[PDB]
């Protein structure tokens, strides 16, 4: 590839700052950019640049070049949840006609919530009557819990929730099953904390 | 802006396919990126203008004819089509601008269609005991058995959509994962304040809206055919 990105991946919490790396052997070159493509969505250019200007800036996203070393940085400034995404370099080229554009593989971020005041606990959520629900919430970030097929239980990812009116964040992780199933079950102590509020 | 139809789509393999782009802000050059999952972006057609027909990567055909529109064409379908399509187009710049990108269409062409099914959506309301401890109220929604992964799952609180205070999966779950076609689970979680909860002129709404077949499709099974269509469910809220 004549586009290449740093790191692969990083992960940060809110309010911080992080720095992406970008390097190409295009040739010859044209001009550069950033795009910001959120999961399942289509990408979003951030800043454009050429030889000419060693520096871009679109809100608290500041680009850099420098065309003799041929590399790009972009520095997110305090990072918001709604940062999380992959980071595309994309490098132009002249042409004959007109252009060519080189995509690199995007670095992934992922922003997480800053958890000040961990409440970690375990509600179980009234059957709908319409399989029962269990929620793990309030646990903070470094908590990792993921999916689970045994054996007729189901657990999902942690997501994070943003109440904006509180000015409150949250993560949350949900179980169910249709069997026997309660919710000590569902979330054993591995991984719960020590301290987790059981009814 | 820049528009693309449909956003999701589930198709038998020999059909014809055509995706819809269309910007109103009267960009001159358009593209076409088919996108695999974690691949990179794939030019696959563009146009220079009001007549002009092949990207860097190489069955599909473009078409443009009026300046607003670019649609694609698939004649026949196959399952090595199954990707993400996206549309962009190009601003005023000195003689590529800035790129504009539509939301993209999730294609998947399977050779049979037997297997789609449609979502079930529950609702489940806050504990009591979260309540008192939090002095919060958090529901969670659940669309399961749903065959393909098209899927679009919202919150609607007393009439309008809600972004604040909800949660979704970002990924599906297998319900049968050691199956290469298996039907999906999908959750969501939308937190109120305790109070608000406790309101019981209070409405929520979990609404999924699945993409399926159409009446034009032909369906042999027992069940009804599983169409593209809107699957919700409720709760109000309860005054303790």
């Known amino acids: 590839n004549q586009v290449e990105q740093s790191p692969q991946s990083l992960i940060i919490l809110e309010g911080k700052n992080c720095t992406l790396q970008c390097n190409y052997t295009v040739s010859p070159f044209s001009n550069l950019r950033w795009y910001k493509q959120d999961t399942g969505r289509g990408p979003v250019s951030l800043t454009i640049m050429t030889f000419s200007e060693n520096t871009k800036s679109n809100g608290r996203y500041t680009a850099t070049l420098d065309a003799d070393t041929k590399q790009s940085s972009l520095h997110i400034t305090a990072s918001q949840l709604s940062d999380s995404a992959s980071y595309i370099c994309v490098v132009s080229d002249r042409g004959s006609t007109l252009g060519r554009l080189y995509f690199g593989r995007g670095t992934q971020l992922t922003v997480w919530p800053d958890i000040q005041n961990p409440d970690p606990a375990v509600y179980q959520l009234r059957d709908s009557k319409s399989k029962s629900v269990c929620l793990f919430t309030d646990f903070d970030s470094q908590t990792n819990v993921s999916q689970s097929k045994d054996s007729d239980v189901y657990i999902t990812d942690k997501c994070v929730l943003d109440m904006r009116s509180m000015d409150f964040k949250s993560n949350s992780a949900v179980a169910w099953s249709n069997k026997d199933f309660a919710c000590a079950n569902a979330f054993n102590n591995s991984i719960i904390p020590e301290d987790t509020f059981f009814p | 802006d820049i528009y693309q139809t449909p956003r999701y789509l589930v198709i038998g393999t020999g059909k014809k396919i055509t995706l819809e782009c269309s910007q109103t802000?009267?960009?001159?050059?358009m593209y076409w990126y088919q996108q695999d999952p974690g691949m990179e972006l794939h030019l696959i057609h563009y146009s220079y203008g009001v007549n002009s027909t092949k990207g860097d990567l190489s069955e599909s055909t473009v078409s443009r004819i009026r300046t607003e529109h670019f649609p694609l064409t698939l004649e026949s379908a196959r399952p090595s089509h199954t990707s993400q399509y996206l549309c962009?187009?190009?601003?005023?710049?000195?003689?590529?601008?800035?790129?504009?990108f539509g939301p993209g269409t999730r294609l998947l062409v399977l050779e049979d269609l037997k297997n789609v099914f449609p979502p079930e959506v529950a609702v489940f309301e806050p504990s009591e005991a979260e309540i008192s401890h939090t002095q919060k109220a958090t529901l969670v929604c659940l669309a399961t058995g749903f065959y393909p992964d098209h899927v679009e799952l919202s919150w609607w609180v007393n009439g309008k959509e809600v972004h604040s205070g909800v949660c979704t999966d970002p990924q599906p779950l297998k319900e049968q994962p050691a199956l290469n076609d298996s039907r999906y689970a999908l959750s969501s979680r939308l937190r109120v304040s305790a109070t608000f909860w406790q309101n019981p002129r209070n409405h929520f709404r979990c609404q999924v809206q699945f993409y399926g077949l159409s009446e034009n499709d032909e369906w042999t099974q027992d069940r009804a055919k599983p169409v593209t269509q809107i699957v919700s469910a409720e709760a109000w809220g309860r005054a303790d």
């Open positions: 962009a187009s190009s601003e005023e710049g000195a003689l590529v601008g800035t790129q504009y």
């Open positions: 802000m009267g960009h001159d050059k």
